[PDB]
């Protein structure tokens, strides 16, 4: 066993009844003085390194050609001047195993952390040396972390796409289904997770040109997509991951759910395609009143009204659907469907739950389209227009397929540096650059939506780490007050940066004029309610930083009205799974699953303590499963009120609790304004 492995395992060997957390630090030293420094490839100077990486097809030469070598040297020197040290063994291990650039045979390390950060910063700046240094300082301080696609692939010749998630709308036609399968394979080839809205597809037993009971429903398309994602599995490196979203009022909703039952037959079971359910407020109202609900056949509704079932408001059209004899429907028990959802989530963690009305009551771009589904991580909530892929030799009507670039603020590092504004603006600029340089040649709706919406996702990580390292319980009202203030600041500065980009470029996102940003409605709660901290401890935490007031929000509203906004969507809180290790941060705004996690790598086992875990903050690092899910819902709703897109909200459940407890948590989330629920992980 390696020396650093033994040093890391020495953490759990208690001394005087206490964990040896400091041993972890020793491990990193070993991991660098025995493996990383020996396995790294050193050159005489930076010029030889850059030339070797360029000619050997490791780096794209275009982004490096925008800078003179003196500027690149200055950027690299700025990166190395911080003398960044990984405080935990797992941070360095995760970076050098998942994100550091290696040779073709993967026998040596070509990229250090500073080298990777410098390359990403130079790609972000697009020829601006000062901007590149700003990005270097932002990432080496670990205030901002680009998503895994962006951080791993920026400036690389053998790179994939920098966009993490893609959302596709599938129209009810064989041509559209085949095009959706093709685009899903193309985007999984690019490495991104693909989500498909199957609510427009007509249910099982519908007519294909006057011959009835002909359609296979959404389950056949689900099987096709599952095989497509199995085939396109990132060249066999990462399993192809897809998501299917169906409205709960679709007739196939049961069969949909039956794809995830552990007793499902092979002709129905789907195993590589995640499932999500979109629940309008009408379904929750029907379940609450115990009135029997009706699921609908989408094609009959489309024939009668000319629009898809998910294209209009069910809260106002459900009674018209039910009373219409030309609309076909089936009777269901909404409470039984809710119990089935809870049982499925207990068994397998599926489906994702999207509360459609919670998303669309604060959605700023309802004029473009209502949000009808979410992404594979159930945090992207954007307007999408379905595409009409016609026959060959016929022009296709290209719609809008959602796609946003992810980037997370490290809350602990951002607040320690007292740089919410600067970090938010620089992250917005980096995400705007990632969107601008993204061009996908096989997904036309994705390309058009990227060019028009200009949507980005700016997330946050290390919420629980910051709260526990500052002596604040994650479930406490003080923690929710901090989240309210911090994310109001993040939203304020993201809107300010979006408006500044719109002013400097003279262009807004497409159809911005009909948005609530243009009409000023979006700023209502910000121009009437003060989001400054209500607790003295939180206010002290925010000292040295100008917390925006109602007057600052009014000025920002006027600025947006004058100049517009460059981005249709700005903030989305992704799960941030593996890149949180490198940043020494807790995953996303979720509470920690465990204080010390035991992970098996190779034939060895390693223990990763939570960042900053110690004796004095052991009980502030409360495990998520031990927490009240209602207070976690309260925290997520408090954050969500300042996030325009959704938050990947994983439910952390105990084995003792029943499906009724899961249903109660889901209904409280819906009541509190939670937009989406990601996972039901049971301990």
């Amino acid at each position: 066993v390696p020396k650093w492995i033994q040093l890391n395992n020495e953490i759990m060997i208690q001394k005087d009844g206490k964990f040896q957390f400091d041993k972890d630090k020793e491990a990193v030293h070993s991991y660098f003085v025995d493996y990383i420094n020996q396995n790294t490839v050193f050159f005489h100077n930076l010029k030889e390194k850059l030339d070797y990486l360029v000619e050997n097809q490791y780096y794209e030469e275009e982004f490096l050609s925008l800078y003179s070598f003196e500027d690149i040297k200055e950027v690299f020197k700025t990166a190395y001047a911080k003398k960044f040290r990984f405080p935990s063994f797992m941070s360095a291990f995760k970076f050098y195993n998942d994100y550091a650039l290696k040779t073709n045979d993967k026998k040596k390390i070509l990229e250090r952390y500073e080298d990777r950060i410098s390359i990403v910063a130079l790609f972000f700046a697009n020829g601006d040396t000062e901007k590149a240094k700003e990005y270097v300082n932002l990432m080496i301080n670990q205030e901002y972390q680009p998503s895994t696609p962006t951080f791993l692939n920026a400036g690389r010749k053998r790179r994939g796409e920098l966009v993490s998630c893609f959302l596709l709308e599938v129209n009810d036609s064989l041509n559209d289904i085949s095009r959706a399968i093709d685009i899903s394979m193309q985007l999984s080839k690019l490495g991104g997770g693909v989500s498909l809205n199957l609510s427009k597809l007509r249910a099982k037993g519908e007519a294909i040109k006057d011959v009835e009971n002909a359609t296979k429903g959404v389950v056949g398309v689900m099987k096709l997509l599952d095989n497509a994602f199995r085939y396109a599995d990132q060249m066999g490196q990462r399993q192809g991951s897809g998501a299917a979203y169906l409205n709960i009022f679709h007739r196939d909703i049961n069969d949909f759910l039956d794809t995830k039952k552990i007793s499902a037959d092979e002709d129905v079971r789907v195993k590589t395609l995640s499932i999500g359910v979109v629940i309008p407020d009408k379904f929750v109202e029907l379940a609450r009143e115990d009135k029997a609900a009706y699921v609908f056949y989408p094609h009959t509704i489309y024939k009668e009204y000319g629009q898809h079932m998910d294209e209009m408001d069910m809260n106002e059209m459900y009674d018209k659907f039910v009373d219409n004899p030309r609309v076909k429907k089936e009777k269901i028990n909404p409470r039984k469907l809710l119990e089935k959802l809870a049982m499925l989530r207990s068994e397998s963690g599926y489906p994702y739950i999207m509360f459609q009305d919670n998303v669309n009551k604060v959605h700023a771009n309802n004029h473009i389209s209502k949000v009808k589904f979410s992404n594979l991580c159930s945090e992207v909530l954007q307007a999408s227009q379905v595409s009409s892929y016609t026959d060959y030799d016929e022009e296709d009507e290209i719609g809008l397929d959602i796609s946003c670039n992810l980037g997370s603020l490290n809350i602990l590092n951002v607040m320690e540096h007292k740089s919410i504004e600067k970090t938010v603006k620089l992250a917005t600029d980096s995400l705007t650059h990632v969107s601008e340089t993204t061009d996908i040649r096989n997904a036309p709706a994705v390309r058009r939506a990227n060019k028009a919406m200009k949507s980005i996702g700016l997330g946050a990580m290390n919420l629980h780490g910051y709260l526990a390292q500052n002596g604040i319980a994650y479930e406490s009202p003080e923690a929710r007050d901090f989240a309210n203030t911090f994310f109001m600041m993040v939203n304020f500065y993201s809107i300010q940066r979006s408006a500044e980009i719109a002013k400097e470029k003279g262009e807004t996102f497409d159809q911005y004029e009909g948005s609530t940003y243009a009409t000023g409605e979006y700023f209502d709660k910000y121009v009437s309610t003060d989001f400054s901290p209500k607790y003295e401890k939180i206010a002290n935490l925010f000292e040295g930083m100008h917390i925006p007031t109602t007057e600052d929000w009014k000025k920002l509203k006027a600025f947006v009205a004058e100049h517009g906004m460059y981005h249709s969507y700005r903030l989305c809180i992704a799960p941030t799974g593996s890149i949180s290790y490198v940043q020494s941060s807790t995953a996303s705004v979720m509470p920690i699953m465990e204080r010390i996690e035991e992970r098996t790598y190779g034939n060895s086992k390693t223990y990763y303590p939570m960042p900053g875990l110690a004796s004095n903050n052991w009980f502030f690092y409360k495990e998520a499963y031990d927490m009240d899910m209602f207070k976690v819902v309260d925290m997520i709703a408090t954050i969500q009120q300042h996030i325009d897109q959704g938050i990947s909200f994983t439910l952390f459940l105990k084995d003792t609790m029943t499906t009724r407890d899961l249903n109660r948590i889901d209904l409280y989330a819906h009541h509190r304004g939670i937009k989406t629920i990601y996972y039901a992980r049971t301990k």
């Binding site: 007793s263 379940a287 034939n603």
Partner: protein
Amino acid sequence: DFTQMFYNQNVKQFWLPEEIALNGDLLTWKYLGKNEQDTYMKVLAGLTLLDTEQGNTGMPIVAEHVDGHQRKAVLNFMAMMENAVHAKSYSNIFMTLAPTETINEVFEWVKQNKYLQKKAQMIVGLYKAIQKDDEISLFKAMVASVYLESFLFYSGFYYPLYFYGQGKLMQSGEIINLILRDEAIHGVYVGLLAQEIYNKQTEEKKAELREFAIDLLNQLYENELEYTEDLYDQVGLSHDVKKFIRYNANKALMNLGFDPYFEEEDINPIVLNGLKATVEPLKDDDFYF
């Protein structure tokens, strides 16, 4: 939660000895050295003898004490495979490769062999100790059964898989691979039945059952090391066989819901080439806060 699924997997894996023609093995058998032929014969007899105990006692005794019609049916199916399919398959392999007198002598030798007998009698002892309506004694026997299915067979399976991965004795190697695939599912299934009993116990009783399982594993493992050297030193393979035993011991433990005992090791590439939460109705007022 699992018996109907295992029923399906078991019955769809049904096969018969006659399906594989064995005679073409003589074209590679004739080219093996005396030590290779000797080891193969001894390993084969070891597997045969252990599998007979499982068919005559192990599976039928567990089927007798387990409650549930569907479980009894699956267990009956597994017992059938031992007696009607596996036993005939081993006999067929022997009759193809050795003359009658050689078969009788190998079985005489392996029947007297100290390391084969030690493990065979240890397992049989636990089957004989099951008491009516005593789930603790049943669990102990299930542990023994899982150890046989998922662990003890593998010091033996190594050699046919080693040849099979090299292009030698392909017909008998195909048969062995089918047998092994059955024993794998048998081990997993009996493992789930043992975990069901284990989970019904107190914390102190659980700790006591864990100690039993680890102690038993240790006794069997130390004898396997001796068994291994006794058979494989003459063909220079013992080091690699030992890695394969530990890897399969870990699988057996995982079948019983226990943590792996041994560190992870890589396996010989030639052998590799051969190889519900409680539903509670919504009571209303759960929609109001």
